[PDB]
Amino acid sequence: MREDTKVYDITIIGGGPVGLFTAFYGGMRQASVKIIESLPQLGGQLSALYPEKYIYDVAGFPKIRAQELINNLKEQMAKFDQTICLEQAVESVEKQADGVFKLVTNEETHYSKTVIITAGNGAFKPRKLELENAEQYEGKNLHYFVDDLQKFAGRRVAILGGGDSAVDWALMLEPIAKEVSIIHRRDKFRAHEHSVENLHASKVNVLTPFVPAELIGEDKIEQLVLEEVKGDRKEILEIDDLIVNYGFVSSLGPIKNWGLDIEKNSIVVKSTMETNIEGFFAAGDICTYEGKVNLIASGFGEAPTAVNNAKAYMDPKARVQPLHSTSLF
Amino acid sequence: MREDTKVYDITIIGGGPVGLFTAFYGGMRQASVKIIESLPQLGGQLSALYPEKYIYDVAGFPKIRAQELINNLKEQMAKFDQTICLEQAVESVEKQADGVFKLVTNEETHYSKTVIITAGNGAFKPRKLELENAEQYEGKNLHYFVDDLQKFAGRRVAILGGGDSAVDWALMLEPIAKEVSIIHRRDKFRAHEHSVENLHASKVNVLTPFVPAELIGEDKIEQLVLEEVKGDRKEILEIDDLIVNYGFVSSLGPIKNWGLDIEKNSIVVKSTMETNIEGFFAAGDICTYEGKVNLIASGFGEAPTAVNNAKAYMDPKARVQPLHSTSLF
Ligand SMILES: Cc1cc2nc3c(=O)[nH]c(=O)nc-3n(C[C@H](O)[C@H](O)[C@H](O)COP(=O)(O)OP(=O)(O)OC[C@H]3O[C@@H](n4cnc5c(N)ncnc54)[C@H](O)[C@@H]3O)c2cc1C
Ligand SMILES: Cc1cc2nc3c(=O)[nH]c(=O)nc-3n(C[C@H](O)[C@H](O)[C@H](O)COP(=O)(O)OP(=O)(O)OC[C@H]3O[C@@H](n4cnc5c(N)ncnc54)[C@H](O)[C@@H]3O)c2cc1C
Ligand SMILES: NC(=O)c1ccc[n+]([C@@H]2O[C@H](COP(=O)([O-])OP(=O)(O)OC[C@H]3O[C@@H](n4cnc5c(N)ncnc54)[C@H](OP(=O)(O)O)[C@@H]3O)[C@@H](O)[C@H]2O)c1
Ligand SMILES: NC(=O)c1ccc[n+]([C@@H]2O[C@H](COP(=O)([O-])OP(=O)(O)OC[C@H]3O[C@@H](n4cnc5c(N)ncnc54)[C@H](OP(=O)(O)O)[C@@H]3O)[C@@H](O)[C@H]2O)c1
Ligand code: NA
Ligand code: NA
Ligand code: NA
Ligand code: NA
């Protein structure tokens, strides 16, 4: 456990589109801002679940690719300073006797005058490989996320999964790795058909329909045993790295342990976006109220409402209504 | 008075950015949509007051020119059918015994299952020329709006005002009209300095500091008498057309006569965006609630909230939550 003893003005739980616009608006109100995000990337549902898809109902965009929207939000907030804490899932939020919120994650303890939760459906986490010794290889050569293609250069790689992630990494690693194998439990992939076309055309070693049976290696993974689906025949791969792309899981989890008024897996908010805990606000898919719709455009309206009311809560001399952006820059 | 006997699903009062996105979302929910707007253009405050300025706090736009945002919204809604009624200010809204709303404007009577008011600060109207006989020349050769530059081709034009509108029309008409004069009550113009530079460089006849003293013409305006400010000297122009660009006025006006719960010139709404009158919703700058901020991004979140709840009000089989746009198109 580490501890950040800077009391931020606004600490945002979740770096999806709504959290990103919340962060931007915090900057507009000259507030110190921290984003805490479970994944090693920002972008929430858009980046994790449909980065390639075109969205048609965000105000002002006849169409926009989901990842492009996320990148635009990142560009928007780039004019201001934010502290971004990735690979941290908030487990505890408590308002201390002095009024300051203490937030504790799996890695670090944080402090804030206000908290704005923009957590969607809860903390995104990778689906884990359900093998007894799999955890022991985490932080060695068992990978759930890929942050650097070049670290596989000249190495033998096995990839588990049949989705766009597994297929994309396989094709991205083909020209870099010494050897790439992809293992999927079905002859049919989930990945986009054009990507699958490219996969079968490539020199990637496709193994279907197989599931991973065991990991052999005293310290580092050395061999991967596979078993055929609807067939009694084992396969053994000599590998240097194992990449697991079994998709994402989310749950509110400990979000339900903080004394919040929660209905139907959503945090209930007043029209100010404030929860039942003073100084604790919510916006986006995580929040609810009579008439709430889970949309990006709805979240993008809730974000500035939360920020501007948070600012007025912190500074009794500050007005809820912000100045015109057209003159501020 | 004319009468449109089609009962629309959603009738929107005001075609500013929030009304435009409301119209779009109506299409997304397969609702018949009408927009009624006071001005001969859509775009509200953006198009009327700052079309040239870059906005920095609309979600997903690092920067966007105000008129470009309006045009983007128009493009968004172009995929669906809307009936657009310009140059109509709604004066009366009444929910009839059958539950259908009757709306009456200066021109036309309309009917709707739901009304969503997106009126901002009230109906935009041009500042009128305060001369006893000025009204008699309306619809002849006295113009508050310019819809067609070419109808001034080869004609003698006088333009009143010192703002960007007066200056822009003067410069737009210079290569088209036989003769252009601009009359402003101050030696200093409000218009952007580069436009004023172009104005003084042009062949436009600049008359400052003058005010219009009287209109001569039995039927059509034939002569315009001007008087100098801080000076006793008259001027007489032979003109074919008079354009008055004295800017815009707005007021809620009759919006306060419809039985709505109004506080501080704003219509109070529940979190569904519904007013105190069932089936009558509000969004954007016209609405208020605890924590409301008058922003484009806020309005853009309120719009879909109003539409989706309006849809559920009209059709008890419809869910408030819409389908994903990413699959709908
Ligand atoms: C396939 C699909 C298509 C869609 N299409 C559309 C569409 O066309 N138009 C539209 O408007 N909407 C669409 N949506 C819905 C849209 O994605 C959501 O409204 C939007 O993602 C909500 O954004 P958010 O920032 O509130 O939440 P999210 O995007 O869910 O982001 C929340 C973030 O919070 C993080 N987090 C949560 N809890 C913690 C914690 N305790 N600690 C640290 N981090 C945490 C998560 O890891 C995540 O990154 C679609 C959704 C899906 C799945
Ligand atoms: C100079 C300036 C700079 C600004 N800068 C920013 C900024 O940087 N960021 C930001 O978020 N916001 C900014 N704003 C505020 C922003 O313009 C408003 O939040 C936005 O215009 C609200 O949109 P709207 O559709 O609700 O209302 P409006 O834009 O006011 O449009 C309402 C429309 O309704 C029509 N109408 C009203 N009543 C009737 C009636 N009875 N019958 C028929 N038609 C009617 C009006 O004619 C008008 O066209 C700025 C405003 C100004 C003036
Ligand atoms: N370029 C792009 O378009 C792109 C890139 C990345 C992600 N995405 C999108 O983001 C979302 C996430 O996709 P992603 O692949 O991470 O995850 P995904 O779509 O959920 O696919 C996960 C894969 O893991 C397999 N799997 C899960 N548990 C397993 C188990 N216990 N044993 C064996 N196999 C198991 C699944 O098998 P089954 O298929 O048999 O269920 C599936 O093939 C998807 O919608 C994807 O389209 C798109
Ligand atoms: N291309 C562009 O950038 C562009 C184009 C169009 C509009 N706009 C913007 O839109 C807004 C509207 O501008 P617009 O010119 O319609 O209106 P405006 O800026 O309000 O200017 C109105 C002009 O009318 C004059 N006026 C008003 N009443 C008068 C009276 N009774 N007698 C004499 N003169 C009178 C004013 O004089 P005084 O100045 O002395 O008060 C002013 O010069 C402005 O912010 C403008 O910048 C921008
Ligand atoms: Na997919
Ligand atoms: Na929710
Ligand atoms: Na101006
Ligand atoms: Na208002």
GROMACS .gro file of C-alpha atoms and ligand atoms in nm, chain A residues 49 52-53 164, ligand 5:
model
    5
   49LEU     CA    1  -1.633  -0.322  -2.563
   52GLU     CA    2  -1.442   0.019  -3.359
   53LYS     CA    3  -1.816   0.093  -3.379
  164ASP     CA    4  -1.128  -0.942  -3.162
  663NA      NA    5  -1.808  -0.700  -3.065
   0.00000   0.00000   0.00000
